[PDB]
Amino acid sequence: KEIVIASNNQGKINDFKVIFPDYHVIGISELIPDFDVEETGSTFEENAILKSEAAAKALNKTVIADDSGLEVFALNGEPGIYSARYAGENKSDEANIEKLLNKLGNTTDRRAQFVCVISMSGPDMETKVFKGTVSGEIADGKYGENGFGYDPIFYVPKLDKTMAQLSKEQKGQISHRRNAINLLQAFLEGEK
Amino acid sequence: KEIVIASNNQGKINDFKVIFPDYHVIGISELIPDFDVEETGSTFEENAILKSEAAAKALNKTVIADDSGLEVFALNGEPGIYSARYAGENKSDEANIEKLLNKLGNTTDRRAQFVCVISMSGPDMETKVFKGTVSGEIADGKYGENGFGYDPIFYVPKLDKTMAQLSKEQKGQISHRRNAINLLQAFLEGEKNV
């Protein structure tokens, strides 16, 4: 009946209420207000697993965490697990965008991907990982006004648009996150 | 550990063997050499369901089937469900490619998408379907010689290669069929009691 989200994002949590409408969906802050997990991992997957396992082992409940980011091929994976605070600790997207555009710069191979890993851990269960991806190219500079993070510089060839130029619903169709959620839903459907 | 695949396409069976290395993959041609289901569906999903349900009823086993195709933007989704027999009923991959290329003679927006729908059917479950896709562009000619079907003209920008240029292992990491099967395998993992 209950499922907890290792996140402080009411957006994500409400999203999860639709995919767990059979469940009571609870934000982690309701159970561990001071939840704080040291992200000592190397990949999005390791960091997702640390978050969901810390909550699940302390709580004896089923919990979902995630971790997301941009990987740019020419920069050997950067910003990677450092996507949010790429250019500094006050996590300014524009600052992040400017550091990325400047480090890439003249480079012709601008191939990149967004990856979202969703982790699910619990007592009667081994921890499960669901990885979604969406591919594209780093643009010339910023283009578009919707979305956030690196969306203005992430060009999507199959749509001829940056992620920022897409509507929210358009983003919701093709995003790395939608891909990870599809994998989760298939698992959930699986247990019936 | 066995999976029966209700497909007559030997190329598909090969891909499936790459994607299920822990399974004994059994192609329908081993069990019913003249398997022949009338694909009267108007979508990939309908065609896949017809194949999986037909094999499952005749064998009283769980099986999977596959109906896949290529949708080219500039042709508003052609060849689509007609992908296999695009150029005629003899189902010549080479003829299908030539037709598609001719029809795109000068076109500059060559965006296309590979689509794969997997359906699972069995005597103890309602039929279930899973869809995978991969994006690319139609090249100006045939490059590479691995794979099958439209592989030699399906250029994958992510990889700077056509599907036919990729090793069987690499194709299996990124194909539309790999993506559909990931949803399937997640489904199977879900039925092992969470």
Author numbering:
A (entry chain B): 2 to 193
B (entry chain A): 2 to 195
Reproduce text from the manuscript describing this model.
The Staphylococcus aureus inosine triphosphate pyrophos­phatase is a dimeric enzyme that hydrolyses noncanonical nucleoside triphosphates to prevent their incorporation into DNA and RNA. Proteins are biological entities that present various degrees of flexibility reflecting their molecular functions. They can adopt different conformations to perform catalysis, ligand binding and allostery.
We obtained a crystal form of this enzyme in which the asymmetric unit contained a dimer consisting of one monomer in an open state and the other in a closed conformation upon binding of a phosphate molecule at the active site of the protein. Because we usually assume that there is only one overall conformation in a crystal, it could have been useful to compute the self-rotation in order to evaluate to what extent the conformations of the two monomers were different, with the highest divergence producing pseudo-symmetry peaks with lower correlation. For this peculiar case, using data between 15 and 4 Å resolution, the self-rotation produced a pseudo-symmetry peak with a 37.5% correlation.
